[PDB]
A paper describes a structure:
Through structural, biochemical, and mass spectrometric studies, we identified the biochemical function of SidJ as a protein polyglutamylase that specifically adds glutamates to a catalytic glutamate residue E860 of another Legionella effector SdeA, and thus inhibits the PR-ubiquitination process mediated by SdeA. Here, we report the crystal structure of SidJ in complex with human calmodulin 2 (CaM) and reveal that SidJ adopts a protein kinase-like fold. The SidJ-CaM structure suggests that the SidJ protein is comprised of four functional units: a N-terminal regulatory domain (NRD), a base domain (BD), a kinase-like catalytic domain, and a C-terminal domain (CTD) containing the CaM-binding IQ motif. Moreover, we found that this glutamylation activity by SidJ is CaM dependent and that the glutamylation of SdeA suppresses its PR-ubiquitination activity.
Residue numbers in the entry:
A (entry chain A): 98 to 495, 501 to 850
B (entry chain C): 1 to 55, 61 to 127, 134 to 145
The structure:
Amino acid sequence: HVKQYYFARRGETSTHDTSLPPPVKVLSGRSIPLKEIPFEATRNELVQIYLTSIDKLIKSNKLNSIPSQQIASHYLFLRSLANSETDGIKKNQILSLAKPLGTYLASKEPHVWKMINELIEKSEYPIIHYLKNNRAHSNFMLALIHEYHKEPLTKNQSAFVQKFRDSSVFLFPNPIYTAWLAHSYDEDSSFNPMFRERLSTNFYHSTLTDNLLLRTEPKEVTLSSEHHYKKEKGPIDSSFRYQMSSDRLLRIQGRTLLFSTPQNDVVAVKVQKKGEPKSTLEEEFEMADYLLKHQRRLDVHSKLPQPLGQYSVKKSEILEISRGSLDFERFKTLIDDSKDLEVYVYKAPQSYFTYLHDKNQDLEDLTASVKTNVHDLFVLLREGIVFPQLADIFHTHFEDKGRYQALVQLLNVLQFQLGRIDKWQKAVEYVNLRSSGLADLGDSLPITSLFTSSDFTKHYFSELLTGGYHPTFFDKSSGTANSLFTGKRRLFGNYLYLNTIAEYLLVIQLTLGSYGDKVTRDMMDKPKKEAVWRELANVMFTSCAEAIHIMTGIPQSRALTLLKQRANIEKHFRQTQFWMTPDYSKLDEDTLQMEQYSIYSGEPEYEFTDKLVSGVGLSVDGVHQDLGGYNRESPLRELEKLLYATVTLIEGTMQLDKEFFKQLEQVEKILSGEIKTDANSCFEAVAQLLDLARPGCHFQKRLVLSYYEEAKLKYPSAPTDAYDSRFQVVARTNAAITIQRFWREARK
Amino acid sequence: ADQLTEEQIAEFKEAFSLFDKDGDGTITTKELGTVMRSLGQNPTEAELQDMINEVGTIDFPEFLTMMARKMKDTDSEEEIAEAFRVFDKDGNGYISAAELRHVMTNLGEKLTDEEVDEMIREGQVNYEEFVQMM
Ligand SMILES: Nc1ncnc2c1ncn2[C@@H]1O[C@H](COP(=O)(O)O)[C@@H](O)[C@H]1O
Ligand SMILES: [Ca+2]
Ligand SMILES: [Ca+2]
Ligand SMILES: [Ca+2]
């Protein structure tokens, strides 16, 4: 064989908060300390307050006065919480409170009591199946605290409620939240983190990801002694010098001179820029070589460049060769001013010098190419390698030009949507994603640089590493600025990780958009244009699913299905097609309003006070199109939903699998005898495993069924009325799958 | 080594990924028996012990060939007969044909309408005979 595996192992650590800027903000040269509002302690204080308030509800005989769907929510929530509680005294306090609600529903609203008991015989956390629709938007837990708790909330409690007022889900303990979140993406789920309040509409996708991430442990990645970023290498050997002939010079691309060969591939001489240190060229050599050597190990699909040397060449010689060609002057300005320039020499197919947005590719080859690029980016991410400058994407608030943050809401204080992209098509003009696969491989970072205060994190994400300041955060009593945000210092690496996943897919989206605009600009055929933009939507959705597959192991077909529960592909195609072409620049206000209604289908239309440039659209500079107005959000609402959907499925699932194995470990200990316990709480621990399995995944359920049998052998003397229906459903499916595999072989 | 179906490889891939706790695309022997159990192929002591001797870590192509070897041991005849049995509440050996549509197409790797119609061929139809055909 050639062994397939990664040179990185992922674990956990105490905190990411090491060697970080002090948590302080300076205002009028006064130093204001930033304090973290603990997420878990505060969540729990509010569930205690919720339980007291139920207690007060009961004592008022006012059950009669709250609607039924709420009483269900309260009952089901209290059963689920009781099931999550290992302390018997608390478990018992919780069911005392449930029982009067149960007495009532049975007696006075019994179609509803019948709906409840169905969910109870499927699950130990039946609330998560109850909240798979519009019911999630009704905050039954905050509503009741508001009615029955007659004290001001604390500062901490108030801050928590401000941030997660959208759903009661945010108050759930870890295993119930994680399981709700994952099952929210399922085929029988119609939940959407969107709700209309008054005439206003509230989008809260980002908040699902923050609520989730604040529960996680600080991750840690260990690179092998053999990793590219670890193994000590010697100097590069350069025993060969390429003899440059102007006769074989195909053209000049950027600072790279391209020469033909007898073999119909290309020799590139990449020439040193002004202010570029020798080492930048060295690292591109060293990373091309590493990837060539480990290509088989990693299943790298790219057609890699082959390194040939790294050495110094006379400028007179570089000038004497280039002199004739077009671009000679631009190349002359681009390259360092020195008599001796460093070059990096390599060989590559022609397809390497083709940018992934090139309008000469037809859709089949573009798709094949995108798939290669996407594959290698996430496979390399698993290996510990990050590429932070695939494209030059920037934001601008008014002038501050800043690096684009794909999950901006998670990484700063009170920013609500993705910002306008400046000169968007230019940002990918020179993207390092090529027709062949990846390029510009030296411009790369060890994944560890995202989990520490590297020069990079301190530079691009210092709000996230420092803490949150805003005037509403300031206590006068403690003299501090308190926030949930300052708590991210401990988990900052987990945030940059997910950001990186969204950012790759953002570059792919911009590249696809550039290709679409270039291909459809001269098309005469309005249905044929629409076709291209529908297919670019399919490639984008598919890429997001490939990323799920590679990071989690969820089959791509299931991942694509999970995405489409949350992100709408009709809307994405409509929005991309409208805002990434200049055609809207010609519409009058009434036509523009009519077109906007179609691409957002009942959601609020994009609002802007900017004046459109004829033949361009939204454009600050009068010439290049932007995505968004001056100081406004990106209009690609669905893209935002899709990037958040993707990144929530990956983390959602890692974190679900963690909850599973913690339960498994508990079931194995009971089963073996390493924890003595009664029958009924063995059955309970097993039923719980069912809930923590990935949605749409059979093989977990099968293992639990096996655990179940094992348990019934151990405690045969004990009824199984509460658990038989769910296990029988798992058993019927396990049996049906074998019959299906049998029939498939027969057809052959 | 492996004449496996697209569907088996999809399943064994996800299972491998799940029990690869550190994401390096290799599982330890610690996990092997538990992962094997999850795929219907719970091993004997000796078979698990023999697999443990063979070794630290196991990549995913090595896994796709451990699984085929254990799969050879399985009698199709018995493993399919014990499945159909679940749908036989009684000892009659009889199931319903109107039904078996609503099983094959509503559970597991669901059959297509053509596949369901194609199966009903080979009032009622008994299972014990159907295995004898294949
Ligand atoms: N670095 C960034 N990357 C992406 N979007 C941003 C960034 N900074 C601000 N935004 C968003 O862009 C819009 C206008 O910028 P601002 O006025 O800074 O909020 C807002 O809707 C912000 O949420
Ligand atoms: Ca480049
Ligand atoms: Ca570069
Ligand atoms: Ca491992």
